[PDB]
Amino acid sequence: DNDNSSARLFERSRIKALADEREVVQKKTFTKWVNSHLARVSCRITDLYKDLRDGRMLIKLLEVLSGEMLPKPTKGKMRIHCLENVDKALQFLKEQRVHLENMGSHDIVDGNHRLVLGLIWTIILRFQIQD
């Protein structure tokens, strides 16, 4: 009742406000970081959530950072082709002993905010960059 209404107020205000504030600032920081590496292949992204759905930006970012060419993307504009390209990128990430969890192809394709942010965070933190 009223106590439940107060609990709903507390959670909806504080938890959601703090989570969204931190997530917005980290999204801006991650976008600014990834654009610098993506500029060398003359590719630029505007929104981090939507432009990683297709999967070509992710495979080109891994192309920049690794220095080794990846298998070519599948020629398609469907859902299953996006799943193929994201699976290729995640297989390459598994190949370099980087540990990822709760991260399937459909999570990146459907555009989950937390999992995309976690993938970018793991790329920033654990991955080895050579020049």
Binding site: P71, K75, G76, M78, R79, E84, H106
Partner: protein, 373 residues
């Protein structure tokens, strides 16, 4: 680049074939084998023993016509070898020894059938790789959505499968043996009522053409019967190949109505809408809401004008009110079982799926159960 595989769809009525990655099949022809009936008095003519494909359909009067596939099961295998030889060497002019082959199968059928196809294609045609896929999975591939329920209906078999996020439910797969050939035979039996007589195998093709041209599914059956009995505005005229003119009339919508009431054929099974609802109801509680909005039709038998509205109305009548029903009927659905196959052979990971020649040589013809779903 690697060699494009051959996508070959073996339907009960028609056989389709083409190259992977194309948007359309390159050869479509009926799966009929005919043999001569009368005696030949002209010396020096052709001495061919078996007509196959469109050539058998070209000369129907002097031939007895047979189907190597009935109810999704191959009954004669020499005729199947003739069908595949005419498909490969004549309709496509390709060499089968350098092309992987994808094949298409109904969900539930005799098991040994699979082995026989494998045992043929590695032995007589010497293909380097081959694969077998279910019809409705390929139809869902060609639909473009991962989650949905697929209802397929051809000339041999009707089947419904549910798939949620790429995961199939084997216990909810439903199969029904009411299909297009049963509708053709029922149309023959109901056209007997007007005095028209059709008995031979050549006349069954005529009846099939009449059914394809002049049949539609009525939205309401009793109202349509009252309308057709009250007035003669529903009649249509057809011209026989020998110049006779016949009038169908009330038989236009009674033949497709047998898809929803199987008691017309004496079968005690349920209609296609009841089969779809029962296949939905066998699934888990959570995934039903996505399945109600993603119903997909497929196969040639679902090309009757007005089938989608009737199916949506009946399923909405069965389903609870708070859920919404969407029937997805693409305009090119007759080739969907082919088209998704042409998608499936073009994927990157499907190169890891093929049953190689070496694997068959190592483990015999029973390997197809370990690899193919």
């Amino acid at each position: 680049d690697d060699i494009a595989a051959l996508v070959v769809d073996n339907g009960s009525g028609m056989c389709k074939a083409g190259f992977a990655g194309d948007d359309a099949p390159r050869a479509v022809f009926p799966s009929i084998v005919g043999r001569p009936r009368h005696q030949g008095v002209m010396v020096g003519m052709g001495q061919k023993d078996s007509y196959v494909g469109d050539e058998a359909q070209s000369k129907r009067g002097i031939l007895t016509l047979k189907y190597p596939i009935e109810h999704g099961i191959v009954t004669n295998w020499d005729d199947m070898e003739k069908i595949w030889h005419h498909t490969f060497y004549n309709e496509l002019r390709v060499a089968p020894e350098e092309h992987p082959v994808l094949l298409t199968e109904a969900p539930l059928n005799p098991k040994a059938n699979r082995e026989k196809m494998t045992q043929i294609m590695f032995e007589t045609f010497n293909t380097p790789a081959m694969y077998v896929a279910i019809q409705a999975v390929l139809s869902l591939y060609a639909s473009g959505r991962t989650t949905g329920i697929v209802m397929d209906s051809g000339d041999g078999v009707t089947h419904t499968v549910p798939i949620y996020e790429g995961y199939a439910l084997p216990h909810a797969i439903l199969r029904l043996d009411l299909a297009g050939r049963d509708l053709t035979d029922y149309l023959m039996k109901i056209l007997t009522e007007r005095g028209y007589s059709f008995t031979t195998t050549a006349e069954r093709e005529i009846v099939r053409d009449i059914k394809e041209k002049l049949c539609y599914v009525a939205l309401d059956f009793e109202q349509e019967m009252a309308t057709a009995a009250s007035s003669s505005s529903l009649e249509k005229s057809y011209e026989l190949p020998d110049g006779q003119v016949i009038t169908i009339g009330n038989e236009r919508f009674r033949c497709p109505e047998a898809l929803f009431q199987p008691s017309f054929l004496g079968m005690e099974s349920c209609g296609i809408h009841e089969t779809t609802f029962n296949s939905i109801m066998k699934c888990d509680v959570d995934i039903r809401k996505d399945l109600y909005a993603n119903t997909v039709l497929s196969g040639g038998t679902t090309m009757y004008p007005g089938i989608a509205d009737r199916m949506q109305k009946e399923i909405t009548a069965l389903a609870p009110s708070t859920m919404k029903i969407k029937i997805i009927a693409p305009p090119e659905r007759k080739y969907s079982v082919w088209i998704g196959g042409s998608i499936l052979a073009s994927l990157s990971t499907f190169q890891q799926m093929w049953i190689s020649k070496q694997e068959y040589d190592e483990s015999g013809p029973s390997i197809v159960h370990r690899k193919c779903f």
